[PDB]
Amino acid sequence: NDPKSQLQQCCLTLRTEGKEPDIPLYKTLQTVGPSHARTYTVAVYFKGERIGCGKGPSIQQAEMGAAMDALEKYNFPQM
Structure with a gap:
């Protein structure tokens, strides 16, 4: 594991049928x-x-900065 739990959980909610698996x-x-x-x-x-x-230097540190930002940068669901 490595990605934020919130991001992982959110990915599961994003399900679309009749289209391509975009996530x-x-x-x-x-x-x-x-x-x-x-x-x-x-x-x-x-x-x-x-x-x-x-x-950031290490990958983990880079994920933390972007991870939190993604919370306020989410747009419409699987279009």
């Missing part, structure tokens, strides 16, 4: 920076709608 899930990105320095960024996408944004 906003977490996916670790790749660290890319101008300097040799490494930067970790985690983003959550919903049918092309961003609802997460937060940068």
Whole structure:
């Protein structure tokens, strides 16, 4: 496990029939920076709608910032 429990529980509620299994899930990105320095960024996408944004060192820390933000950035259900 690793994702926030609230996010996991919410994913279950998002069920759509007669369409494709579209659900906003977490996916670790790749660290890319101008300097040799490494930067970790985690983003959550919903049918092309961003609802997460937060940068940090470790992945866990990055998830915490974006995880809380996603609560106030939720839009209409499975469209």
